[PDB]
């Protein structure tokens with residue numbers, strides 16, 4: 001069984017840079033290496049076959065090089081849509097067909113400040129006995145952000161769940177969705193609900209709020 | 216127009232078995248090998264086996280030898296993979312992949328995937344609740360954000376689609392990872408509508424649709 005090892009395991013580059021991912025084999029596999037690209041939430045796609053042959057319809061910025069043990073995928077001019085995990089695969093000693101561990105490509109860009117939106121629980125959901133208050137941060141970079149919920153200027157801890165997206169395929173930015181969860185009762189016991197967002201594109205923390213039922 | 220369309224996501228208890236399908240189109244099903252590869256959450260790709268859709272022959276990987284079974288039905292050009300005695304380690308996305316060439320075999324067409332979640336929970340379709348924004352200082356020239364909240368759905372195989380009140384599609388789908396809480400998942404989608412459109416328009420709502428393997432659901436989201 002031939003083990004494929006990719007290097008680096010995570011790579012950062014800005015749009016327009018040359019990217020070079022390496023795949024090494026435990027033992028010679030001649031030109032029997034294929035390169036695939038998996039974009040978040042999608043299935044792998046064949047980019048290169050036979051080490052240096054481009055699958056019809058794949059952009060020409062992708063290129064394969066190599067023979068024997070050391071192989072290299074090269075992206076001449078990285079573009080925002082090349083965000084993905086790239087995998088190499090050997091078809092020389094089959095079975096088993098073996099893949100590399102994967103190289104995640106992270107696109108680096110300039111700072112972008114989030115756009116913040118607070119959303120109060122819906123009347124329907126309130127009739128369910130639950131109350132979810134949402135706070136959305138939109139198109140920001142870098143990924144590091146802080147969402148702090150405050151009910152009646154009371155810092156809330158243990159009731160909020162967050163979820164960050166993957167880099168956008170056009171602007172390479174992130175978005176985030178924090179959600180506070182109270183019981184309909186608990187929600188009907190307080191007045192002001194706010195989220196304060198901290199991000200280095202904001203010159204100071206940005207709070208957005210709403211008043212219970214004043215909506 | 217080569218395409219491989221797989222079955223839907225499934226939740227199975229430990230010890231159970233699952234059979235996933237892969238309907239092929241756009242080529243001669245019997246002339247190309249069909250492999251199966253799986254991807255655990257966050258981890259890489261793992262070859263499972265192949266089937267010759269013409270002879271019925273199979274070759275599995277030792278890890279799965281004795282627990283997997285790959286079949287085909289050439290009349291419906293479909294391929295099958297049944298994994299039994301399911302364990303948590305088997306929660307993953309199972310893909311079918313066509314292979315080409317006989318020397319440098321390469322998986323040139325892949326499927327969409329089929330999530331299999333091995334858990335103790337039960338499956339449920341989502342419940343949709345709208346999200347309308349209520350700011351302390353609404354600005355006319357700023358874009359208008361509306362949203363949809365899906366709750367209590369399992370497995371996490373939801374697809375949020377949005378449509379205008381005039382039926383046409385909304386290509387502003389902002390999608391966030393689901394969140395697990397209480398054995399069931401919850402997700403949030405957001406659409407940002409230009410001000411040029413909500414100002415100059417008299418549409419009162421936008422429709423949030425969600426597709427889940429245990430029931431598709433819809434909800435109207437008011438347009439402030």
Ligand SMILES: *[C@@H]1O[C@H](CO[C@@H]2O[C@@H](C)[C@@H](O)[C@@H](O)[C@@H]2O)[C@@H](O[C@@H]2O[C@H](CO)[C@@H](O)[C@H](O)[C@H]2NC(C)=O)[C@H](O)[C@H]1NC(C)=O
Nearest residue numbers: 379380381382383408409412413414415416417418419421
């Ligand atoms: C369906 O509506 C879209 C958008 O309409 C505007 O936005 C809606 C949310 C609602 O407020 C409507 O009342 C508004 O009129 C139409 O897309 C627009 O089409 C025009 C001309 O093609 C273009 O100038 C706009 O920029 C488009 N805006 C967007 C966001 O696409 C679309 O044409 C409508 N479809 C049909 C069949 O009527």
